[PDB]
Amino acid sequence: KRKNSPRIVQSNDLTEAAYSLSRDQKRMLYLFVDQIRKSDEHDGICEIHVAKYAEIFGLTSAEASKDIRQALKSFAGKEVVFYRKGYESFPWFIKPAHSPSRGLYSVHINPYLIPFFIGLQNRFTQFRLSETKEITNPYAMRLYESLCQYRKPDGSGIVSLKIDWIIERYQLPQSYQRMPDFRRRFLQVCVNEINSRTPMRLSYIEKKKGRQTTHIVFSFRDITS
DNA sequence: CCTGTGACAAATTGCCCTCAG
DNA sequence: CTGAGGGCAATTTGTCACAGG
Ligand SMILES: [Mg+2]
Ligand SMILES: [Mg+2]
């Protein structure tokens, strides 16, 4: 099969939020949201084990330590903003991470994010973790999550996304407001990298209005077709 | 206006090595 | 032996000048 990798289940509000995290931060953010789904009333305290992280992401003990230490530092000052319109901004962490023993980090998610993570019925995105552990460009990650929000059961879909919305929720660098660059350094990159490192296969077409290009119409099928 | 491309810069990659318990 | 450190060269991301439809 391919069903042994953990099932990531995030609310569509998180899928659509505007924030900025590295690949490495997003890698961890998948793990945290997994822990949180164990509540009979959860508090926002998560733990991270170097040794297991290495096995999941195919990295050496030493380099897995570099990756974790450096991102935990980079969280501070980083906000996530939720919409639906609507406008709300929260901090990811409320305390610095730390290590009570070798190999172990304790992080403290803002408890208020707990409902935005768990979400509402028939209103959520889902994907296996194995589906996304070989992506490098975090932007390629954000797009894949989005596509997954519209995946039918047979692993196929069609969705049109407006470009001014991608620049906003995915918080793209300034210069990609000039379409030639948006084309070259974001769209063609994140599409090839999905085609290569995920079980999804993707094509696209550009919706133009006047001289301006305004929407990307993404459609895809699953490799097991 | 729109487009693509060449050049330059600043950032991320996997990889190497030392050293402490 | 693991993992907390320091470091590096090659490749990928981000910016912007110039040329043409
Ligand atoms: Mg990054
Ligand atoms: Mg790394």
The number of strands is 10
Strand content: 25-35%
Which ions, cofactors or small ligands are bound in this entry? magnesium ion
Strand arrangement across the biggest beta sheet: 2-6-5
Shape: globular
Helix share bin: 25-40%
Main pleated sheet: 3 strands, antiparallel
Tally of separate domains: 2
Query: From N to C, what is the helix and strand string?
Result: EHHEHHEEEEHEHEHHEE
How many helical stretches? Answer: 8
Oligomeric nature of the chains? monomer
- Alpha-carbon Rg, integer: 18 Å
Straight-line distance between termini: 14 Å
Domain Initiator Rep protein WH1: 8-148
Protein name: RepB family plasmid replication initiator protein
Keywords: Plasmid
Pfam families: Rep3_C, Rep3_N
Question: How would you sum up this structure, described in words?
Answer:
InterPro entries: Initiator_Rep_WH1, WH-like_DNA-bd_sf, WH_DNA-bd_sf. One of its GO terms (biological process) is DNA replication initiation. GO terms for molecular function: DNA-directed DNA polymerase activity. The relative contact order is 0.15. By secondary structure, the protein is α+β, with helices and mostly antiparallel strands. The protein is built from 8 helices and 10 strands. The protein has 2 domains: 133 residues, no CATH class; 92 residues, no CATH class. Helix 3 crosses helix 4 and helix 6 packs across helix 8. The strands form 4 sheets. The protein has a 3-stranded antiparallel β-sheet with strand order 2-6-5. Strands 8-10-9 form a 3-stranded antiparallel β-sheet. It is globular, with a radius of gyration of 18 Å. It binds magnesium ion (2 copies). The chain binds a DNA duplex (21 and 21 nucleotides) through helix 4 and helix 8.
